[PDB]
Design an enzyme around this catalytic site. Structure first.
Site: not given
Ligand code: CL
Length: 175
Positions: A11, A20
């Site tokens: 992450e 994202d």
């Protein structure tokens, strides 16, 4: 190596709100906030959406962050989100059985998937989950790759799949 270190690698860590690949505003260590409008969207819908994400952050942190948090705060949200992922697994009738049948290393891989796509999403990998429970590692590996997940985030998915395959942390070592 452990679930926290594993997810920190997959992450990353960003102290400012960003979006994202799935087009979701996020912050810290993969902490999802809100979805973002189209790239054309509307100069208005844009600011609205940004403020929506900012309000979520202040709510989560409990203060006026203005879209910026500290490392300690990022880790605080991370601890909460990792816990939420585990609890989600345990409360789900399709996931709990698989989770309990797995060794500790493979359990981390499942948590990783749930952390990224959520309880509901992962619980949908019916065939993959059955293969994992049957400990048919190589077949599960081949099946897991036949997914949007794999196609959209191939490098991360490959690390997770290899972990399910080998039952070792080899895909995360030397990183
Ligand atoms: Cl939260």
């Amino acid at each position: 190596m452990n679930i926290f270190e594993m997810l920190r690698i997959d992450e990353g860590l960003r102290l400012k709100i960003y979006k994202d690949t799935e087009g979701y505003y996020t912050i810290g260590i993969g902490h999802l906030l809100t979805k973002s409008p189209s790239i054309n969207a509307a100069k208005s819908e844009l600011d609205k959406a940004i403020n929506a994400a900012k309000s979520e952050l202040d709510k989560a942190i409990g203060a006026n962050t203005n879209g910026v948090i500290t490392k300690d705060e990022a880790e605080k949200l991370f601890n909460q989100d990792v816990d939420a992922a585990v609890r989600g697994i345990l409360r789900n009738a399709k996931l709990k059985p698989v989770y309990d049948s797995l060794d500790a290393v493979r359990r981390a891989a499942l948590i990783n998937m749930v952390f990224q796509m959520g309880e509901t999403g992962v619980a949908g990998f019916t065939n993959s989950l059955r293969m994992l429970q049957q400990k048919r590692w190589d077949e599960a590996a081949v099946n897991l790759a036949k997914s949007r997940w794999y196609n959209q985030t191939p490098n991360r998915a490959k690390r997770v799949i290899t972990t399910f395959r080998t039952g070792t942390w080899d895909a995360y070592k030397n990183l």
